[PDB]
Structure formats: C-alpha cells, structure tokens
C-alpha cells in the first residue's frame, strides 16, 4: 500500500492541470459511455425530458501512466479536482446536477497504461421540442447533444466507446405514456466558422400509448354522439323529450371537452 | 464508525394494473460508486432482518399501509465492474376505502338509478328521457372526477374498467 502511495505522489507531483494530454501533439481522443438509469418526466408543457445517467469518459494521459502495480487504481473522487478532465457539456440541457449523497458521485480510475476513466452520476433535464399536432397519435424525437465547450477537433475528439453498445439501459426503460421504439448514436464534427467542433448525439424515438385516450376521451365522446341520434327514433311531437336529450348531450359534450382541456 | 442523517427520494416502480387494489415493493438500494466488488464490500452489522429498523411512529403514509421490510444483498455487473448492492424492500398496500366511498359506490348508485327507469310507466317519455340523459351526464362527471385522481398511465386500471362498464350500462339503459 505504501508503494502505491509514493506512486500516486509521483504521478500527482509536477502535474499541470492547465495543459491537456498531448498538449503540443495530436488531439486527445475521448471515448464516452452512458448507462441510462431512468427517464422520468417527459413533459409536453415544458418541452423537455428528465434523464438520470452514469456518464463515463475515457482518455489516455501519458503523464498518469505508472508501472510495477498490476491493478487499476480507483482513487478517491476528490482527486478529480487535481487532474485534467475534458471540456464536455450538454448543449440542450436546462438543469443538471451531480448527485451528492453520501458524497459527490464521481469516480476516477487510473490504469497502468495511462488511461483515465472519469465517471459522473448526472440527472439532467434536456429540451425536447415536440410537434404535438398529431397528439395523442404522435411520435417524438428527444435528443441529448454532447459537445466540447472550448476545444476544436484539432485539440479533442469524441467517439462512442464500444460503438452502438456505448449507451446501455435503454432496453430497461419504460415510461407511463411512451415506449422507446428506437435509440440511435451519431458522432459528427459541427463545422463552425472558427473550426470543426466534435459532437456526439444520443436520440430516442418515443411513441405515445393510446390506452389512456381510447378509454378516457374517445369512448365517451363516441357514445354521447351515438346517444344524440336517439332523438331521431322519438316521435316529432315529443318535443320535451327530444329537446332535453339533444341539449343535455350538448351539455355533456361541453363538460367532456372542458374537463379534458383542464386535465390534459 | 460514521453516522449520517439523510433524506432520500428514491424511485419506486409501480404496477398499477390493479389500482386501487394494488400492492408494491418499493426498493432502497445502495453501494459504493467507485470501488468494485474486489475492493469494497458492504455487509449488514447484524442479521439482515434486524439491520434495518423502522421507528414505531415513523409511518408518514396517507394512502398506503407499510406492511414490512425485506432486507437483502446482491451483485450488479455494470459497464465498469461488479459492485455489491445492499437493498431493502418496503412492502406497501393501498387503502381502498377512499375509492369505495368516492368512486365505486356513487357509480354503483348511479347505475342503480339508471336501472330504476325501467319501473316508470312507458308513457312518461320526457321524464324517462331526461332521467337517462342526466344519468349519463352524472356518470360523465363521476368518471372525470375519478380519473382526475390517477397518474397518467397508458394501460387500463381496474377502476377504469369499472367506470367504463358502468358507463356502458347507463348507455344501454337509455
């Protein structure tokens, strides 16, 4: 355990957090993994969805390479303040935080080859502009965009670690209103005027379920409309009955529409 | 020995097929974030049943009855390694009397009303017409009020089926 202590002291001593790995060299490639713990508040009112994730970043830093210790050094999370970490940020987020009980849910893991794993437990609300014209018979595309704030492709490069297996846990997700038909990962360099900036994007296609609406809204409307036709089979002279039936069907339909407007 | 006082909001997936006659097992799971099974392992101080103690007065539940707790331990194999996960499951059963008095029983009496129309003389056409259509309106109001007090799940709960069947009954009576 002591030898590990002087090893860690050697690594951290003379370490400049201001300089990225391969500062003068080629760009540092940052692999990314996500494990979706939950997707909770898919809000049509606010045009956003809440998502909890384990977000891992992998990158090789030769300064932190060590030898003579054949095990992966999982260090206390506070050392993340002492190491360089990427400039990653979620472009479309509105409110995000790291869970902080019992401690800040961070993980720093060094490997003998110099690889650094940086894991964060993040709950973030992300904007998802919904076209609800076909509501409730609608399908939404909700995306999470990941970008580097202050680095271009000549300095930092993003990729999905493990290919299409980079994002996991989507198969285990289920929403009360939606079902995840498909999820996609795409990596691309946004060619901004200053330069090309790396970007990753995780998209979900959500299909709304209509069991709610077949019972709540469509069936009472259909049956009230059917009841409105009973007036045709009543004699023309029975003015009170036919009038009461028709106008009370109007009132019931108004009640349905108004209370549906309130609830939805 | 390291003691803390915490307030934890935790996810509880619920199968609301049998609402309000449904029962749930809400989990509380914890473990090390960074250290895998080969580095840090959690254990219960005493026997697992007696290592999670609920206070006698500590049941702040309105619509649920906390039947008991089940304490266990397990392993989770994540993308970063295997982790020991210590879990508790609180077993909750919903209280049904509210939905009996507020939803089921008014719906039953409204269906009984809609059926009482058959005992009026057939020549009271306006009376029976108004009676049936106003009964349909009453069921509409009751159904709206009932579903105001549910979460926005997709599939049909038991009380939804009860309301739909009663609504079909008043429709068929008219």
């Amino acid at each position, epitope marked *: 355990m002591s030898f590990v202590k002087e090893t860690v002291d050697k690594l951290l001593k003379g370490y400049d957090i201001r300089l990225r790995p391969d500062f003068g060299g080629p760009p540092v490639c940052v692999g990314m993994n996500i494990d979706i713990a939950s997707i909770d508040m898919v809000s049509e009112v606010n045009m956003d969805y809440t998502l909890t994730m384990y977000f891992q970043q992998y990158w090789r830093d030769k300064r932190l390479a060590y030898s003579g210790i054949p095990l992966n050094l999982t260090l206390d999370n506070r050392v993340a303040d002492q190491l360089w970490v990427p400039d990653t940020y979620f472009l479309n987020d509105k409110k995000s935080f790291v869970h902080g009980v019992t401690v800040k849910n961070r993980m720093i893991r060094l490997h003998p080859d110099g690889t650094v794993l940086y894991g964060l437990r993040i709950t973030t609300t992300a904007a998802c502009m919904m076209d609800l014209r076909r509501y409730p018979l609608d399908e939404q595309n909700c995306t999470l965009e990941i970008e580097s704030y202050g680095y271009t492709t000549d300095d930092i490069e993003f990729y999905w670690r493990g290919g299409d297996k980079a994002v996991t846990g989507v*198969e*285990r997700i*289920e929403l009360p209103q939606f079902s995840i038909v498909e999820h996609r990962l795409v990596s691309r360099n946004v060619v901004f005027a200053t330069g090309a900036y790396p970007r990753l994007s995780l998209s979900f296609r959500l299909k709304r379920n209509i069991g709610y609406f077949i019972l709540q809204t469509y069936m009472p409307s259909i049956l009230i409309t059917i009841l409105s036709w009973v007036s045709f089979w009543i004699n023309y002279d029975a003015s009170a009955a036919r009038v009461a039936l028709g106008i009370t069907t109007v009132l019931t339909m108004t009640t349905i529409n108004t209370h549906l407007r309130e609830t939805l | 020995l390291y003691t803390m006082r915490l307030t934890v909001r935790a996810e509880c*997936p619920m199968h609301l097929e049998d609402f309000p006659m449904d029962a749930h*097992a809400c989990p509380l799971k914890f473990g090390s974030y960074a250290y895998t099974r080969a580095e840090v392992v959690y254990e219960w101080t005493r026997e697992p049943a007696r290592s999670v103690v609920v206070a006698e007065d500590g049941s702040r539940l309105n619509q649920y009855d906390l039947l*008991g707790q089940t304490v266990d331990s*397990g*392993i*989770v194999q994540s993308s970063t390694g295997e982790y020991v996960v210590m879990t508790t499951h609180f077993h909750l059963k919903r209280k049904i009397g509210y939905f009996v008095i507020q939803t089921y029983l008014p719906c039953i009496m409204t269906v009984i009303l809609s059926q009482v129309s058959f005992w009026l003389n057939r020549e009271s056409v306006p009376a029976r017409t108004v009676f049936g259509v106003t009964t349909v309106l009453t069921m509409t109001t009751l159904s709206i009020s009932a579903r105001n007090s549910l979460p926005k799940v997709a599939y049909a709960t038991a009380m939804d089926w009860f309301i739909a069947v009663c609504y079909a009954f008043v429709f068929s009576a008219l």
Partner: nanobody
Amino acid sequence: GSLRVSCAASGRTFTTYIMAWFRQAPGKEREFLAAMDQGRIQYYGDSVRGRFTISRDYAKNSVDLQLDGLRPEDTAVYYCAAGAGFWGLRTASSYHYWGQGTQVTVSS
C-alpha cells in the same frame, strides 16, 4: 460439466418484473436459486452462490441461468418464474408466473 438453461417469456413484457429461477428436488421442496430485477441486480441463494449466474435479455424478454460446476445432488426440476416481489424476492408465493420446468440430471 457446464449447462445453460434459458427462459423465453411471451404474452407480456417483463421489463419491470423480477425474473427468477427456482429448483425443486424430489421430496417437494422449492428452492430459490437466483433472481434479477429491473436494475440488473443479481440476488442468489447461499447454496449456489458464485456457481450459477443469472442474466436477462430485456429486448428479447428472456432470462438465462448459466450453471457451472454441476454435482450429482443438483439433479432436479428447474422452474422459471416472474412477478414483482411483494413480501418476497426469495419466496415462491411472490411470483405470479411460472414455467413448465426443465428436468436436469447429473451422473457420475
């Protein structure tokens, strides 16, 4: 000897349910073996801890049990079960769905 017992579920999606395996040797006693919940958390019985491994395919809605290190006393009928664990997660009464079973025999 090594073996793998798979269980495919049809008729309902068991993403939120706890999928488990039980064993029944001759003499009519059902024994809990392994279980996995929605969080991929694996619970095991003491008798088969570290030997049998339980996994789930949520896309295919199936649960697999890999059996390594079989001994003659493991000869029994293995049942696949599903259901939310109420008062349970180690009791057969908490599972509302059960499989036909699979007979496994070991000879020395």
